[PDB]
Design a protein around this nucleic acid. Structure first.
Ligand SMILES: [Mg+2]
Ligand SMILES: [Mg+2]
Ligand SMILES: [Mg+2]
Ligand SMILES: [Mg+2]
Ligand SMILES: [Mg+2]
Ligand SMILES: [Mg+2]
Ligand SMILES: [Mg+2]
Ligand SMILES: [Mg+2]
Ligand SMILES: [Mg+2]
Ligand SMILES: [Mg+2]
Ligand SMILES: [Mg+2]
Ligand SMILES: [Mg+2]
Ligand SMILES: [Mg+2]
Ligand SMILES: [Mg+2]
Ligand SMILES: [Mg+2]
Ligand SMILES: [Mg+2]
Ligand SMILES: [Mg+2]
Ligand SMILES: [Mg+2]
Ligand SMILES: [Mg+2]
Ligand SMILES: [Mg+2]
Ligand SMILES: [Mg+2]
Ligand SMILES: [Mg+2]
Ligand SMILES: [Mg+2]
Ligand SMILES: [Mg+2]
Ligand SMILES: [Mg+2]
Ligand SMILES: [Mg+2]
Ligand SMILES: [Mg+2]
Ligand SMILES: [Mg+2]
Ligand SMILES: [Mg+2]
Ligand SMILES: [Mg+2]
Ligand SMILES: [Mg+2]
Ligand SMILES: [Mg+2]
Ligand SMILES: [Mg+2]
Ligand SMILES: [Mg+2]
Ligand SMILES: [Mg+2]
Ligand SMILES: [Mg+2]
Ligand SMILES: [Mg+2]
Ligand SMILES: [Mg+2]
Ligand SMILES: [Mg+2]
Ligand SMILES: [Mg+2]
Ligand SMILES: [Mg+2]
Ligand SMILES: [Mg+2]
Ligand SMILES: [Mg+2]
Ligand SMILES: [Mg+2]
Ligand SMILES: [Mg+2]
Ligand SMILES: [Mg+2]
Ligand SMILES: [Mg+2]
Ligand SMILES: [Mg+2]
Ligand SMILES: [Mg+2]
Ligand SMILES: [Mg+2]
Ligand SMILES: [Mg+2]
Ligand SMILES: [Mg+2]
Ligand SMILES: [Mg+2]
Ligand SMILES: [Mg+2]
Ligand SMILES: [Mg+2]
Ligand SMILES: [Mg+2]
Ligand SMILES: [Mg+2]
Ligand SMILES: [Mg+2]
Ligand SMILES: [Mg+2]
Ligand SMILES: [Mg+2]
Ligand SMILES: [Mg+2]
Ligand SMILES: [Mg+2]
Ligand SMILES: [Mg+2]
Ligand SMILES: [Mg+2]
Ligand SMILES: [Mg+2]
Ligand SMILES: [Mg+2]
Ligand SMILES: [Mg+2]
Ligand SMILES: [Mg+2]
Ligand SMILES: [Mg+2]
Ligand SMILES: [Mg+2]
Ligand SMILES: [Mg+2]
Ligand SMILES: [Mg+2]
Ligand SMILES: [Mg+2]
Ligand SMILES: [Mg+2]
Ligand SMILES: [Mg+2]
Ligand SMILES: [Mg+2]
Ligand SMILES: [Mg+2]
Ligand SMILES: [Mg+2]
Ligand SMILES: [Mg+2]
Ligand SMILES: [Mg+2]
Ligand SMILES: [Mg+2]
Ligand SMILES: [Mg+2]
Ligand SMILES: [Mg+2]
Ligand SMILES: [Mg+2]
Ligand SMILES: [Mg+2]
Ligand SMILES: [Mg+2]
Ligand SMILES: [Mg+2]
Ligand SMILES: [Mg+2]
Ligand SMILES: [Mg+2]
Ligand SMILES: [Mg+2]
Ligand SMILES: [Mg+2]
Length: 61
RNA sequence: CCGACCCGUCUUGAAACACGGACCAAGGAGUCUAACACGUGCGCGAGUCGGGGGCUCGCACGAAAGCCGCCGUGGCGCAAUGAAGGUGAAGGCCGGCGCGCUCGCCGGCCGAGGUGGGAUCCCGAGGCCUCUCCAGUCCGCCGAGGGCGCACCACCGGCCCGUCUCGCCCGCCGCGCCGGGGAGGUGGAGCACGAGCGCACGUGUUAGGACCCGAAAGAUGGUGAACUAUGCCUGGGCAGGGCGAAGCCAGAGGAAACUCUGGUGGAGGUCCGUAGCGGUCCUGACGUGCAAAUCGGUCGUCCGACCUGGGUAUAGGGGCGAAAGACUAAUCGAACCAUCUAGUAGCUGGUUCCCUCCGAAGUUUCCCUCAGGAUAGCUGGCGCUCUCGCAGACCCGAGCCACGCAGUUUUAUCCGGUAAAGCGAAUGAUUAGAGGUCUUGGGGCCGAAACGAUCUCAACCUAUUCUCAAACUUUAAAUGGGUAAGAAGCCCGGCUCGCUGGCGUGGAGCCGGGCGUGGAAUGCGAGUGCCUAGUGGGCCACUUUUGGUAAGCAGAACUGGCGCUGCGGGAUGAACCGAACGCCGGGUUAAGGCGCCCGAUGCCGACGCUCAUCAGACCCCAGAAAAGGUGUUGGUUGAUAUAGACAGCAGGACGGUGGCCAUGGAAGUCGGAAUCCGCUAAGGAGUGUGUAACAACUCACCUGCCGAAUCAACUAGCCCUGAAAAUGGAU
RNA sequence: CUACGCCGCGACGAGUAGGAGGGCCGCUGCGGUGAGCCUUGAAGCCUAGGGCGCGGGCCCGGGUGGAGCCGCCGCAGGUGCAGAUCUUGGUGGUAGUAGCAAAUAUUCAAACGAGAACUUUGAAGGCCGAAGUGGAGAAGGGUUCCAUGUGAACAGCAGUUGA
RNA sequence: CGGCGGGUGUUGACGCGAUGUGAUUUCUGCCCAGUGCUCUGAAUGUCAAAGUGAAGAAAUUCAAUGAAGCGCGGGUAAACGGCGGGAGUAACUAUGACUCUCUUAAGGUAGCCAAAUGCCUCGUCAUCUAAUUAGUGACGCGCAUGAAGGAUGAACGAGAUUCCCACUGUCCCUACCUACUAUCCAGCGAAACCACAGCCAAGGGAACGGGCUUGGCGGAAUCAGCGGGGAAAGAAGACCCUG
RNA sequence: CAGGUGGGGAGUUUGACUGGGGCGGUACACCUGUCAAACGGUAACGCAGGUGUCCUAAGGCGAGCUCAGGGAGGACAGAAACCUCCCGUGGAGCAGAAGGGCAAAAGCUCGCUUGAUCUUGAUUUUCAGUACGAAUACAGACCGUGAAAGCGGGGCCUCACGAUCCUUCUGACCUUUUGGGUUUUAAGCAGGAGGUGUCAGAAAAGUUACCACAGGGAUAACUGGCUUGUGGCGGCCAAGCGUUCAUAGCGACGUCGCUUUUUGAUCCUUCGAUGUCGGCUCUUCCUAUCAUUGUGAAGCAGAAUUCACCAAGCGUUGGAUUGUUCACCCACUAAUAGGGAACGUGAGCUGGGUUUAGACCGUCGUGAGACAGGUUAGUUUUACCCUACUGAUGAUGUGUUGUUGCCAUGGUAAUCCUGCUCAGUACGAGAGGAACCGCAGGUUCAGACAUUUGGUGUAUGUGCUUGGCUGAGGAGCCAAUGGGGCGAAGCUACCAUCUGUGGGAUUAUGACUGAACGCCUCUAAGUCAGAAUCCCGCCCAGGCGGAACGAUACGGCAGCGCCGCGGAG
RNA sequence: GUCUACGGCCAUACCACCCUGAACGCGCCCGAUCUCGUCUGAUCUCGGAAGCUAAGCAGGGUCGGGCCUGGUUAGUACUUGGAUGGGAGACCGCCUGGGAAUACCGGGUGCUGUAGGCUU
């Protein structure tokens, strides 16, 4: 009739059998969720980043 | 000799007083079809596939195999997106004019962009050679650095379809409520130089009998009234007695009315009681029977609603019922037969060869969910992407030493409100005095009179005081949780922006360049994908912990274990202690032991404690408390004593005063208070016994004998009392 | 050096539910193959016989048997049993046991016969006691009726008797 | 199922059909609010299809009209059923003849009772006995009696109960006898049941062992009994829960 | 065809959790504090509570103020009316439960308003990292307020809520409406609403004792096990009672235990079944002893009684009522003690009760039906197996066989009362009133026995007798023992009769001597007495235990014993 | 050495009382025509400059309260890990590491940024 209601016994062992892996950190974290206004200006900056290539190459030279 | 409980099964737990199993032989349970998904093998490959048809002596095989190609119709793939109308996946650079106006017409190129990683490949300064050198003949190896970068991953851009917001243009045989564009967000199972198709095999899920066996039921169509129930037809049957209804006859008594008496008669759902029919009690017999309802005795009725044969009628959700849900062929709260039907089952039982490797869960969320599923977790299988190097034919390295990871520490840096602590800190609770001056405190001895007064109790205030808190708190641990400890870092410049803006401002992005002592310890090779079974009843122990008197109770946290696990020890034992396991030999241990059972103390083991007429004897653990002991052993504190202890024996133990008041006597001793002095060595105006009260004993106080240590109160070891249960018995 | 082979070094080995691999483990049938085996003896069965393998299992000897069978490479299954109050068949212990006890009752002699408690005849003693244990029918049975013969089985002992 | 089909019905209210109660005797009280049943529509509320009218191009929409039924209103309790409270009130208290009220409608009349109906209860009182949770009689604010069923009343009953006489082996308290068994023999010859089996104490253990541990111990093969055990057999518990 | 009626009939349903289920409750969807063990998470029908709403302002801005309370003043005015000053860290208020938060605030009073509006995404919370709900940060419009910075897309924060399908409304000069076109209609796209509270969301009343099936010891009713609140029985302290005096006998306030003979709590075993109350019968065990034996104490003069010790050997009864266990009464008694053994005991019985099916009453229910309410009637099966036990043969071994024996071991048995005498004695003022020895008998029990008395009697012994039968007499028989009187033997009855037993060590206890502790002391060493107990005797059986003794195989080849170390094996 | 305006940290800064304040400043102060608000020019707003440090403010003082920081409390309480340690239990001791809080007793009583003044 009545049964055990809840337990976390053995759960920690189950969690550590395959290890509790941290999230896979890597370069270039995603841009989703960032402020839309700042994001659209960043897109504009990237689009127009091509112009001034001659100036950048002359300065580098 | 040692070890050894009976297997299977469900179960937290089986040798179980849990179920199945007397024995043996043969049979006996995950199959086939279809549809999916993924993996693997094969062929072809932007294709692929003839499976349906046809052609080929119509045929032993051959119902096969071979071929078709204007039989590829068609299926699947090659294009997506939208409800739909419909629409429908190529960018980059280099130039001139419009204003190179976030840009329109073209040119000329290349043909899916870029960043960071990236196996492999390429170049490579410099090194390696011999009998030797100044000077080159040719190829092999190592090699710092640099380059092109597969697949794949992360990110940023771009393209297609839907849908919003904004805004300016363009096109025309239809100038329109027409058509087409652009920018910025956002929705898509998309594009971004295809990977599919067919066949085979495996695994998983599913629909089908669906691993095998199993309901109570439901439906369709039939067979039964030979038993019984009831109606009808036509037959048969029921000793002997008792009571004595109406009708009738006679006699008697009566003034009459009429009454009485004796016969006769033979009624009755009448009585006793055969046969018949039934079936009360013995709760008799029997109870694997004579019998799937019988037998013995005892019983009910026995002229009637009586018993009975045969013939008939009523048939299943129907009949029939003097009614019990009774009876309807040993079947009735819905007969029997066949079929649908191998009905369904979240439930029970079973489920067939060996070895090897890996190896669980009883938890999360949802469910008319609680004996079940889905889901995540735990498992297995298949891989794939990388890292370290592999070394020298034998021999022989010639600061600096892998991508990365972690149930760990260290170094910094945060987080917390438990334990503890606190209440002369807040909020609640709570004890006691003290000191104060006001009051709707009671009031308060003589004060109405100005309580002339000021004594007391309250409340209040002040400074203290005792005790507390899971749902209080100033303070505040231990254990714990997060982050960081570099090349994705640090530092220099430069470019872009429509965001931001006093500003060469801020911020973000991008492009070059330089920095390597690789910036704690320790250990370890990592990353990533697909498919996936079983499980989803748990239980136990230390510690924390809630409810409960408690529980071998119920409920949580942490870790470990049992389940799933054998072995050594605990005599015995799922969980305790040690330790985890291939088959063996030698050595040594753990926990635990070493009188004998029974391996080992058969040591000239050490020091003590302890006697029990219920001794004691080892984690869990299998039994005990308060309170006692002049049993004994230690210890603590105090006290006395050669100015003579303690104990024994022997002396004294006096006056006021028979002290005050209680009285009926209380003289030291029933009592209420007081609590002295003189003689002293000592004497209490009294320790108890005692008396009516006295008296008499005796103490507390001194003295004599005795000559050396003694007394008291505690304390904690072992032992004893406390300590009573049922078959005879358990270190 | 059967490269699906051979060799070397190091570490490791518990296991239910469950997953996977290997099987020169086993059964049946099909395509190949063994110039396979076999009446000078196949399958099957039995065996204090000899062995191999961790094991599933297998080979060989002896006996019996009397006509078919197996190895290897592939293929395909109605392919492996201790259980299911399993299905069918057979067999034990129980066990020479329970039992052959309702309705009073048999005895003597003889015959037949291998054989007599049970048959038949005779003599006794009893019972049913006319609402019968008597004599005849209906339903139902279907040859049980009646003679002769047999002594297998049946008549829960026997039988010379019998439905 | 169906036919103007069929049963009652070869019938006709002294008859068929449907109910309740249950001979005789004696009574059968109050309640029509509820639920039923039934009766008249009295304007009258609601109320389908069809039909009618309007709008519309039509589909369609709207409106009017209003069958039965329900609703409204009467009757009905030998229809189902129900028959409680509260306030005041008599010259001892106490009760309430009397007067009012509330829920609905009426408040349990006549009778009967610790009854086969009463919990408390083994009620209280009388009787019966030495002793009575029994019996009878009586009382009655009766948990929760009661009138087509109440209260009686002869006869009857394989109905339930109590007492008395007689009678007895029911008992004190058992014994003996008979028949058939059982028993033994000749013949014949099953079945149930069966993991293996079968001596105990304690321990631990699924918390009551035949097996295990520690002890006690253990001597072929059997016969007649016996009913302590085998948590004996018989049946997949019928109680309880779940599905 | 339409409407009404329609359990006459059909089909179906009649939640879940749950210290069994039902009744109760909601721990079923949520929120606060605690539990919770200082990150987060964490359970029980854990604790204290709350929720299914309310608000055009209680939403949004801005401005200005300060709240609760207290002190001191002021006509009525007082503890509370209003006015003024001062103190006032919030001790108030913020809609509600609680917690957090808040002072020129988030509170109060005003002014203006509608950001409680139109949109796309992201994120947090529960989480599977699904949804809903709620929430956070942005972005794009359109606004409100303020001088402005700013703030606002509901409420200071933590809760206040809801899928598919369907319906309804709103929006796009939107899409489709099937050969084309127009118009109604319908379908669609996007967003609100109508709701599932069992709150991830079926459309749902009972009863069954006439019942059924698949199961469950996952789960109750009876045993057992853990526990011991409750029940029962004890202990410690001693305020008091006891004329006096705590403790002869008691024991308040407290406090420590034991028992499993009560009742609970739990749910470990059993649901392919462990027969469930009581009585009857019978055995054994416990002691917490009612009586009896031996004792100690007293508020013990005697008698009677009370308390305690060793102690379970022995006994603990006959009846009325009731099914009863209990209970109560009558009567006897030495006493009429309490318990266990699967609440001992159903293949031992009985079946009164509970607890099937029939039936009546009362109450409940519309009804079927229900009722730890009453009443009545209601099938009690099997042993032949194994062991246990009771008896009965046997078996091992001594060469065979017999007689006579011993005793290991096991069992074990006696009990209680009355009368006389002691003795009208001790004691006592008196009334009353014992005991030891001895004697005579009983009760219960045991073991026998049959002379006597009684019972039986099928000696089928002998008379009598009924009905029938053999022709009658005589003699008999049949009637399941025809009936009846008397009856031998045998068996048998407290229904007759006989018999029933000694010692030892000791317990409790009282003592001796005697230290410890120059005293005392039953104790420490050493001694004594001492009992229904214990052991043995007497009595019953006689070991896989012995002893002594006897006889030990032919009238025929036939066996055996002793002697020999005699031999060969 | 100070002040003013705006501040940062937010008591070492707060609170109670007393003393001192030169120069600027900050204030008190005067008034209501305008701006603007009131029951009230008290507040708010505005226009001023006779007087004053009386107050605010600043500095100082108090065996001051508080606050801040040390000591003591105390290696105490508590606690990680361990034992076949003790005890009938309740609980306690030890090993291994960590380690508080009152009461009581000391010291301290704002630091500072920007901009602008005064102080011989
Ligand atoms: Mg569970
Ligand atoms: Mg099972
Ligand atoms: Mg279980
Ligand atoms: Mg088992
Ligand atoms: Mg058991
Ligand atoms: Mg079972
Ligand atoms: Mg069986
Ligand atoms: Mg079987
Ligand atoms: Mg072909
Ligand atoms: Mg085509
Ligand atoms: Mg790349
Ligand atoms: Mg992208
Ligand atoms: Mg799948
Ligand atoms: Mg099947
Ligand atoms: Mg159905
Ligand atoms: Mg018939
Ligand atoms: Mg008659
Ligand atoms: Mg009669
Ligand atoms: Mg019977
Ligand atoms: Mg019935
Ligand atoms: Mg079936
Ligand atoms: Mg649901
Ligand atoms: Mg199960
Ligand atoms: Mg907390
Ligand atoms: Mg605390
Ligand atoms: Mg406090
Ligand atoms: Mg638990
Ligand atoms: Mg398991
Ligand atoms: Mg494991
Ligand atoms: Mg193990
Ligand atoms: Mg062991
Ligand atoms: Mg042990
Ligand atoms: Mg070894
Ligand atoms: Mg040992
Ligand atoms: Mg040894
Ligand atoms: Mg003791
Ligand atoms: Mg293994
Ligand atoms: Mg098969
Ligand atoms: Mg087989
Ligand atoms: Mg078999
Ligand atoms: Mg026999
Ligand atoms: Mg017999
Ligand atoms: Mg006769
Ligand atoms: Mg005849
Ligand atoms: Mg014949
Ligand atoms: Mg025969
Ligand atoms: Mg009638
Ligand atoms: Mg009408
Ligand atoms: Mg009327
Ligand atoms: Mg009345
Ligand atoms: Mg009554
Ligand atoms: Mg009665
Ligand atoms: Mg009686
Ligand atoms: Mg009466
Ligand atoms: Mg009436
Ligand atoms: Mg035993
Ligand atoms: Mg079952
Ligand atoms: Mg069943
Ligand atoms: Mg129905
Ligand atoms: Mg924690
Ligand atoms: Mg926490
Ligand atoms: Mg404000
Ligand atoms: Mg906005
Ligand atoms: Mg739900
Ligand atoms: Mg259980
Ligand atoms: Mg108690
Ligand atoms: Mg007194
Ligand atoms: Mg449990
Ligand atoms: Mg049974
Ligand atoms: Mg069983
Ligand atoms: Mg039994
Ligand atoms: Mg005793
Ligand atoms: Mg019993
Ligand atoms: Mg029995
Ligand atoms: Mg029985
Ligand atoms: Mg009965
Ligand atoms: Mg009944
Ligand atoms: Mg009867
Ligand atoms: Mg026999
Ligand atoms: Mg003896
Ligand atoms: Mg005796
Ligand atoms: Mg005669
Ligand atoms: Mg004669
Ligand atoms: Mg005759
Ligand atoms: Mg006769
Ligand atoms: Mg006689
Ligand atoms: Mg006698
Ligand atoms: Mg003594
Ligand atoms: Mg002596
Ligand atoms: Mg100070
Ligand atoms: Mg420590």
């Amino acid at each position: 009739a009545k049964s055990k209601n809840h337990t976390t016994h053995n759960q920690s062992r189950k969690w550590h059998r395959n290890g509790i892996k941290k999230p896979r950190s890597q370069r270039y974290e995603s841009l989703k969720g960032v402020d839309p206004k700042f994001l659209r200006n960043m897109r504009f900056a990237k689009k127009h980043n091509k112009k001034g290539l001659k100036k950048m190459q002359a300065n580098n030279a």
